[PDB]
Amino acid sequence: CLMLFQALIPPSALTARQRLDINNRFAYFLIKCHATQATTARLVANQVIYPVDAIDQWQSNGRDVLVAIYNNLLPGELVLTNLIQTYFRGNTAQQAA
Amino acid sequence: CLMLFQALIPPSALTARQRLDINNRFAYFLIKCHATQATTARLVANQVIYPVDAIDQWQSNGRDVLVAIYNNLLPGELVLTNLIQTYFRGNTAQQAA
Amino acid sequence: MSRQMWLDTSALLEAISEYVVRCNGDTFSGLTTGDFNALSNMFTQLSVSVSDPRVPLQTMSNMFVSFITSTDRCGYMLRKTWFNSDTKPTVSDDFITTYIRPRLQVPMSDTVRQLNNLSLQPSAKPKLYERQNAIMKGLDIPYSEPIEPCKLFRSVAGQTGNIPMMGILATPPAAQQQPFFVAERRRILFGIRSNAAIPAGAYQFVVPAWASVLSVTGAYVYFTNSFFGTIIAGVTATATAADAATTFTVPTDANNLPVQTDSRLSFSLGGGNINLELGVAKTGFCVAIEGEFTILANRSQAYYTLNSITQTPTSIDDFDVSDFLTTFLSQLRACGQYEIFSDAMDQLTNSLITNYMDPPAIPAGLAFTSPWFRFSERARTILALQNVDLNIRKLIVRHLWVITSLIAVFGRYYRPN
Amino acid sequence: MSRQMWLDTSALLEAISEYVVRCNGDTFSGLTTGDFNALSNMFTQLSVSDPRVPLQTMSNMFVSFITSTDRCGYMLRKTWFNSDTKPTVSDDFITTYIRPRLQVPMSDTVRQLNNLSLQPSAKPKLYERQNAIMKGLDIPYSEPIEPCKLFRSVAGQTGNIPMMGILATPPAAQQQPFFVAERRRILFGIRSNAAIPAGAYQFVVPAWASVLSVTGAYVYFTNSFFGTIIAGVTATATAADAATTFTVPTDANNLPVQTDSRLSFSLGGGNINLELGVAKTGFCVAIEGEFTILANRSQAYYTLNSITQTPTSIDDFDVSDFLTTFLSQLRACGQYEIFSDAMDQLTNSLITNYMDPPAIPAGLAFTSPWFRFSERARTILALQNVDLNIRKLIVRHLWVITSLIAVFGRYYRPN
Amino acid sequence: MSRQMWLDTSALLEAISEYVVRCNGDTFSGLTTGDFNALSNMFTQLSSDPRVPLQTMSNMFVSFITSTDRCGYMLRKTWFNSDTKPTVSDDFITTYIRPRLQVPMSDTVRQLNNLSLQPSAKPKLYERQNAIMKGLDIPYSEPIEPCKLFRSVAGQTGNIPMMGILATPPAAQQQPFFVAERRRILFGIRSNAAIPAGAYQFVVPAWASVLSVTGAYVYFTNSFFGTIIAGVTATATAADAATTFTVPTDANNLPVQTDSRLSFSLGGGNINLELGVAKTGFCVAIEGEFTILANRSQAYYTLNSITQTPTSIDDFDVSDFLTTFLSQLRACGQYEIFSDAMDQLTNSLITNYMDPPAIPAGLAFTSPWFRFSERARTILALQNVDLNIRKLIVRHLWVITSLIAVFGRYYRPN
Amino acid sequence: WFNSDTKPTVSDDFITTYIRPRLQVPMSDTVRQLNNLSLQPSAKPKLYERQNAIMKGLDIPYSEPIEPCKLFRSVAGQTGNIPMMGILATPPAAQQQPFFVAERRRILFGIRSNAAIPAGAYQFVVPAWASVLSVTGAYVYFTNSFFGTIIAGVTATATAADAATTFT
């Protein structure tokens, strides 16, 4: 639903903050459901993603974690790349930021 | 009764869900009552079947356990190969699948 | 990941092949075949997370081609560390994640292999797996496995080439020339050419380093005049029933081995030199050892580790990859990628060589004369860079081979759409 | 019945043969083997304890069947080879043994999946050859073959083996190029009594060989053909000599000659371009290695489409090699005579149906028996009063019947 | 035990071989394959790590086949001649040698086999043991290299030897020759002057009178084992008249120098070549797939195709199977010790096969126990001993050699 | 850039503004594939199609026509195509070697000579470049013209009697 909801409203419709939040919830979802134990570990190590078990830290703001993941994926991680790219309608990890 | 009942009705009469459970409830029964202490152990080791006390790991989810037992039987395990093959009206394990 | 992993999987895809072959036309309507029951379970092991095995195999090959093509992705496989050690690499790549994983049952697999080298009738045409394990981990090949000696051939101080000698051998000689040691598919030849008779008596022949690992069984030894069906000049294959017996000896057997006899011999050029005793003077002779050739136990390391090499340039075969690449090449041509794939391989190759050389940069004077799949030749070209340490050259050829072998196994079901 | 239902079974019997060879000496007491448990059920499929009985019984009825033009006649009409139409013929044999046995569609997928596998069987069953000659299917890409079989006649040379004699006779003047093939290698070159200058020379790869591919092949100068010295050709050379190389339109790089390097190339481009580095008084190049038929090109060989002239040299797709067992059984019970006469009948009655108006053509006399196919094939493919295409089909058709015999009669025990 | 109980257990180990090969590199973790269940139950029937039980066995077998006191009973003519249950208690024999094959099934299967389409091209020893010992049949379709089938006959003494001779320009028209290579058969007539057109008969030597060819090409050649034959012309012209030959089994002429694939049998009598044109010496070649006619395999394997003395004899391929065992022997210094213990085994065998119980005079071997090809000729060259007894000795010694090649392989004492 | 579909590191606004994915997928592709097999492809193709071939090595429509002379490359015997014109116009000295030129709408091959060539069989080899062509609706005949220029040392002349001249 949220995803479909996004196609009916312009960005001007939500708080600059919530639009950011949404991105993070998606990010969490990606890491928690579509990332290999390896991809996660690397991202955790390089301080891009907050440890998966840091509930509170994933809910704070000021960091478009989605953008971070997108910007730090490896050329090999095809699935994640597709998911994120499609979400961002083609813009590249660079153009996104 | 359930086994007899299966001869008065075409597959179409039962939920494709239940039809699957039935096969599983049967596989459970085979492994529980007609399988060698040695046959069981092999399956468990090769991750074909879950131990019988794993009451929770047998509850249904997509996989057709029976088909898997059948697919991993050994020539010498005549007892089971009969039960299963007869149940499956002569189709081979790869046919049943 | 682990070099080991790429192998276990390769072995599995080779297993898949083996059984796909065994099941061809052996798939019947109410007939449980132990074979098809395995081919079945194996597919399952590729990656469930089904009816047409073509699809999943196809999808896999496709992703492999995509992988082995991008230096960015398969890059980790082109560094000396990958070939040298069993270190779990920190690399996530959808492909590696999904398909490359430990697949062989340890320790059992190893013990079965050992038990094999010792068995009666090994496979005459062995899988790539074996060759990989030899070329990479330098493991033993089965004691009873036959091989064509001419492959075993490398260049030594005396004569530069094997096939090249054929042209010389066919030319009538000027004076008595030095001895020669050539090899064919099914037999070994050695002797001395001369325009004037050679006295009866003893003569020693230095068994060249390359053949010094050979062994025969059920072999007939005789005087002949042909090399690969080409007439050798300066040698007489004539003899009379009255002639004095000609025999030779090997440092391994205390007894004399007969020549020109209907007796089936068994000896090994595994020692020092062979001592031929010409019973009658001849105007040039050529002995032939024609039988089943095998590589002496625990000496296969010479052929496969490229240790039987010391001259430069040298002649070198290709451990038979060229024979396996056929399918994959037919596919690449089937969908117009033969060109692109090539260019990608040149890239693969260069980037590989680069890493094997401090400082990280292509060596001057390197230009291949052949495409990525004529390995035989590129191996020579690489084993000919006099500005690069020898041991390094060897590793490069060894390494590059394994990659090529892998491409031949994995790429086969490739079909883009 | 259906041409399929026949092959579908020929593959079953040909499967029992394979599987028996697996249990031989591997049949132990107390041990239930995967191989035997299978063979054991492959017997249960012909009798809708003792396998010799039904197998023998079957072979027997088959001979009885394939013998009477009244019974197996439906199999001798063009319709049976051309289509999968279920025939309305009730014959005890057909009813009891000829039925669909292969699992569809799984089987074909497995077969396709095969052509792409690494190590195919080097000595393939008859089934594969049957499907190729009949349904024009593909043969595994990695299966090897002896190029000489692939040979057929072309404008220049009317033969391969026959050229042996001419090659061995010293030459008068520079002759035209030659292309011959052995069991494990191909030879091409130019014969001459006087030196041939250095430079480029083109060789038209003949229609029959344009479907050949090699791997791990050595290429050198030779003078022997099947072990018979070739005259008018110098196999001599020096270490100082200028290198000699040739090119194929498939590869952009020059392929070296007289080197210890193992080559891989394809004669598909149909054009070899040799560059003799040093003038030679007649030369002969050899390509010795593993030979395979280019993907999607095996149709030429098995469909007799590689045939352009008349008469023509033609092999036998190897049936000769499978008939042995059946023949040995025929001789051991004197039927060898009777069967041969019943096949001349089979063969005649077949050729008959393939020709309008239904009657034996004039000038037809066989020089050999039903089992020397290789020759009977050339005989049929030599009747210039009958359309070429129809000639081909007859050969192909008869081949399939010949093959079914080689498979079904083996257990023949008359008495 | 019984000559049988040794074959049944030789077949068991020869199955464990085949299956150890089948299972190499087909031993993946999540599946227990058909093949591995077999190889794993075949270990159960030898009474975790299969190297151990197989090694223990080989060790005990070498210890047994080494001591004449133990393995003696096996060297007596009674053991090769009959299925008599010996009253000999020996740890080895009790533990490993026992009836293993399923009767009557095993046999019927084998029979059914000889009749099948594609038999093993490199058969196990088992088949060869049954041929040489019980004089049983070999699969009708199994191929073999004709030059092995060769024995010496009245006319020419040897095969390979003839090479030197054929290579020497002749003086005058000599007698016909009948040689054999690995993949083909040669026959013809050498001369320094033209041989007129017309018919000529060639006597098919007793050793080759059991051969059969399929997919064969017949042509004029001038090479033997890659050695140029002199006094023969392989030349011809397209205009030349046709040269055909006949066999007493086929009413039709078989062409020569044609691309046609022939099928004929050298069993029945003599071949009638018909030189169409006059040739300065000719050599015909029959290159194809060679097989041993049905029910005529008793000739080659029962040493019945032997008529002269001395004679040229092959080795029934034992040399090819011994390789493993030998490589094992050399890796542990035993090579020497084993050889001497074999010379002992051999002597003691020849002994019991001769009344009175003693080594014959003039017997000295020129080769070691494993070069059987030669030792067989040496034993088949003692004119002071009945011929039929000479044959039985070779046959009997072969079987013992083969058993060694099969059981020894896993030898490791240390 | 040419080798891979790999993401660029560059951040320039012209790129951001105008350059970005535009084609539907996978549909856009399954169409251009389904195309190759269509009966009447475009006579004058878009640069897109060429771009794809030259870069990803993609298939061109099976039924697409092309002027062969473009396909021409240099080979062993012949240096070029149009240059051979001045030569084919010069009377010959003796029987020369096989020539294989190409025009806009036709393929030319033959053998010139100042002295008659016997009747019989001659073998021609198709140059590596022309070995890709295929023709339909073709009139194969004898001529003395090349790009509107006279080919000397060759004479196309006949008689209702002449024996049939064919090729294979």
Q: How far apart are CA D229 and CA A6, in angstroms?
A: 85
Please report the DSSP string for D272-298 in residue order. Answer: EEEEESS-BSSEEEEEEEEEEE-TT-H
Which of helix, strand or coil describes residue A9? coil
Do C331 and D116 meet the contact criterion of CB atoms below 8 Å apart?
yes
Do E397 and E377 sit in the same domain of this protein? yes
Domain that holds residue D356: 1-139+297-415
Question: Which residues in chain F have their CB less than 8 angstroms from residue A92's CB?
Answer: 7-8
CA D325 to chain centre: 19
CB-CB neighbours of F45 under 10 Å: 14
Helix-then-strand count for chain E, H and E: 14, 11
Tokens of E136: 């049983």
Resolution (A): 3.5
Q: How far apart are CA E91 and CA E89, in angstroms?
A: 7
Do C182 and C153 sit in the same domain of this protein? yes
CA–CA distances in Å: residue F31 to residues B42, E90, F37, F61: 51, 81, 10, 12
CB-CB neighbours of B59 under 10 Å: 9
From E248, E279, E295, give the residue that closes a domain.
Answer: E295
Do E167 and E100 sit in the same domain of this protein? no
CA D279 to chain centre: 39
Q: How far apart are CA A1 and CA A7, in angstroms?
A: 10
Do E188 and E283 meet the contact criterion of CB atoms below 8 Å apart?
yes
Contact A94 F6 (CB under 8 A): no
CB-CB neighbours of D53 under 10 Å: 13
Which of helix, strand or coil describes residue E284? strand
- Bridge partners, C410 (sequence order): none
D contact test, residue of E21, E109, E282 with most D CBs within 10 A: E109
Residue pointed to by tokens 């529980």: B32
Among the listed residues B94, D275, C132, C219, the one whose alpha carbon sits nearest the alpha carbon of residue E323 = C219
Name every residue whose Cβ is closer than 8 Å to that of residue F9 and which is 6 or more positions away in sequence. Answer: A94
Tokens of A48: 């891009």
Contact D261 C377 (CB under 8 A): yes
Do C345 and C260 sit in the same domain of this protein? no
C334 vs F: CB within 8 A: no
Contact A76 C90 (CB under 8 A): no
Cα atoms found within 13 Å of the Cα of residue C267, Cβ hemisphere only:
30
Instruction: Tell which phi-psi region holds residue F147, choosing left (phi > 0), alpha (psi between -120 and 50) or beta.
Output: left
Q: How far apart are CA D283 and CA D230, in angstroms?
A: 10
Closest residue to F6, CB basis, from C72, C336, C340: C72
CA–CA distances in Å: residue E171 to residues D237, E168, E196: 34, 9, 17
Do E236 and E380 sit in the same domain of this protein? no
Do E211 and E265 meet the contact criterion of CB atoms below 8 Å apart?
yes
Closest residue to F57, CB basis, from C70, C339, C347: C339
CA–CA distances in Å: residue E359 to residues E310, E353, E395: 19, 10, 18
Do D90 and D145 sit in the same domain of this protein? no
Tokens of B5: 């009942």
Among the listed residues C88, C133, C121, C416, the one whose alpha carbon sits nearest the alpha carbon of residue C301 = C133
Contact C97 A78 (CB under 8 A): no
Radius of gyration from C-alpha coordinates of chain E: 25
- Cα B28–B32–B38 angle (5° rounding)? 120
Do E45 and E125 sit in the same domain of this protein? yes
Residue pointed to by tokens 């099947």: D226
Burial D308-330 (b: 16+ CB within 10 A, else e): eeeebbbbbbbbbbbbbbbbbbb
Do C155 and C292 sit in the same domain of this protein? yes
Name every residue whose Cβ is closer than 8 Å to that of residue D413 and which is 6 or more positions away in sequence. Answer: D56, D59, D60, D329, D333
CA–CA distances in Å: residue D64 to residues C363, D342, D410, D414, E115: 76, 11, 13, 9, 19
Contact E32 B47 (CB under 8 A): no
Any idea what DSSP says for residue E169?
A: P
Q: How far apart are CA C344 and CA E73, in angstroms?
A: 70
Which of helix, strand or coil describes residue C231? strand
Give the strands of the sheet with E244-247, arranged side by side. E198-202, E271-275, E244-247, E250-255
Among the listed residues F76, F50, F75, F51, the one whose alpha carbon sits nearest the alpha carbon of residue F64 = F50
Report phi then psi at D389, rounded to 5: -55, -40
**Domain count within chain E:** 2
Q: How deeply is E318 buried, as exposed, middle or buried, from its count of CB atoms within 10 A (0-12, 13-18, 19+)?
A: buried
Question: Which residues in chain F have their CB less than 8 angstroms from residue A70's CB?
Answer: none
Do C125 and C280 meet the contact criterion of CB atoms below 8 Å apart?
no
D157 vs E: CB within 8 A: no
Which residue type occupies D232?
G
Do C150 and C294 sit in the same domain of this protein? yes
Residue pointed to by tokens 């391994």: C252
Do E41 and E131 sit in the same domain of this protein? yes
CA–CA distances in Å: residue C351 to residues A74, E93, E133, E296: 19, 63, 63, 64
Question: Which residues in chain E have their CB less than 8 angstroms from residue D316's CB?
Answer: 215, 261
Strands (E), E205-257: 211-220, 223-224, 227-228, 244-247, 250-255
Do E289 and E323 sit in the same domain of this protein? no
Do E127 and E277 meet the contact criterion of CB atoms below 8 Å apart?
no
Q: How deeply is F144 buried, as exposed, middle or buried, from its count of CB atoms within 10 A (0-12, 13-18, 19+)?
A: middle
Q: How far apart are CA E318 and CA C151, in angstroms?
A: 26
Handedness of CA D113, D116, D119, D122 (dihedral sign): positive
The CATH number of the domain where F128 resides is what?
A: 2.60.120.170
Distance (Å) from the alpha carbon of D41 to chain E's nearest alpha carbon: 14
Q: How far apart are CA E65 and CA E67, in angstroms?
A: 6
Name every residue whose Cβ is closer than 8 Å to that of residue E226 and which is 6 or more positions away in sequence. Answer: C224, C225, C226, C229, C288, D227
Contact B74 E32 (CB under 8 A): yes
Name every residue whose Cβ is closer than 8 Å to that of residue C392 and which is 6 or more positions away in sequence. Answer: C356, C357
Q: Going by DSSP bridges, is the β-strand pair E250-255/E198-202 parallel, antiparallel, or unpaired? A: unpaired
Distance (Å) from the alpha carbon of D192 to chain C's nearest alpha carbon: 18
Do E239 and E174 sit in the same domain of this protein? yes
Name every residue whose Cβ is closer than 8 Å to that of residue E19 and which is 6 or more positions away in sequence. Answer: E35, E38, E39, E42
Burial D406-415 (b: 16+ CB within 10 A, else e): bbbbbbbbee
What is the experimental method? X-ray
Tokens of B58: 């047998």
CB-CB neighbours of B27 under 10 Å: 23
